[PDB]
Amino acid sequence: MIQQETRLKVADNSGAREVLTIKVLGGSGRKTANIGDVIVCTVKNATPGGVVKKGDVVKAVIVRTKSGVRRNDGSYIKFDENACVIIRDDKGPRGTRIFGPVARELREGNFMKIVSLAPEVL
């Protein structure tokens, strides 16, 4: 459940560590985003060097929310923090190394590169 002004850790090696979200895109009046949804965001804390620099406006995909997801079998999955991965406006990442676990609902959105680069997919 990511709305405007939430802060997310970044789970790639693109260069950013902390990110603030500006907009949940989709339709007009869209308030909250969750796993698989794309957001636009700002980098509030970056790593030295790196591709992306603090103050940049970028697009990200949400992975491993805390208020996680229900599935059609009635199973649920949750995580302990909220995280995102920054993308290249083609569902591809700017980094080359995803960290932490990732949800299985990314396959339904054509994020196969992230799914492949990731460790354990749940």
Partner 1 sequence: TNHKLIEAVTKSQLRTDLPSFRPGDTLRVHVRIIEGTRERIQVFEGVVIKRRGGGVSETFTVRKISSGVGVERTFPLHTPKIEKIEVKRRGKVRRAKLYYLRSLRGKAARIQEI
Partner 2 sequence: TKGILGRKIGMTQVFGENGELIPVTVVEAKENVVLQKKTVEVDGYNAIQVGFEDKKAYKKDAKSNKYANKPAEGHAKKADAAPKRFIREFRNVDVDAYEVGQEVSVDTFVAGDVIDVTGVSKGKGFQGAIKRHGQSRGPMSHGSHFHRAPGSVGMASDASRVFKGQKMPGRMGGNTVTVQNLEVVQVDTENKVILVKGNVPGPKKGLVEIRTSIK
Partner RNA sequence: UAAGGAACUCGGCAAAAUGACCCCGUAACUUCGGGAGAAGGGGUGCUCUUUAGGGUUAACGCCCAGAAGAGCCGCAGUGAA
Partner RNA sequence: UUUGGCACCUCGAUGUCGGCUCAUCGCAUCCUGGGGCUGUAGUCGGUCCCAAGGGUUGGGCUGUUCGCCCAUUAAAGCGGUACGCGAGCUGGGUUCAGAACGUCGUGAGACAGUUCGGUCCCUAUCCGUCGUGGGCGUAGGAAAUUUGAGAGGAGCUGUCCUUAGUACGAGAGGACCGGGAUGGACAUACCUCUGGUGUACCAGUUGUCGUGCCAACGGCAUAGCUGGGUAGCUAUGUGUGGACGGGAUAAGUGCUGAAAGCAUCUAAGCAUGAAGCCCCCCUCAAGAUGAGAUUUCCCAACUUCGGUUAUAAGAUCCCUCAAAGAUGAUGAGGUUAAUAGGUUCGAGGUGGAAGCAUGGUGACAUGUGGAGCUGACGAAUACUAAUCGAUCGAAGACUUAAU
**Binding region for RNA (CB under 7 A):** 1-7, 22-23, 25-32, 40, 57, 59, 65-67, 70, 74, 76, 81-82
28-87 positions binding partner 1, by CB under 8 A: 64, 73-81
Q: Contact positions toward partner 2, by CB under 8 A?
A: 72-74
- What phi-psi label fits residue 96: left (phi over 0), alpha (psi between -120 and 50 degrees) or beta? alpha
**Do the beta carbons of residue 65 and residue 34 sit within 8 Å?**
yes
What kind and span of H or E run contains 17?
strand 16-24
Provide the 8-state DSSP code for 82.
-
Residue 100 makes contact with partner 1 by CB under 8 A = yes
Binding site residues, partner 1, CB under 8 A: 64, 73-81, 99-101, 104, 119-120, 122
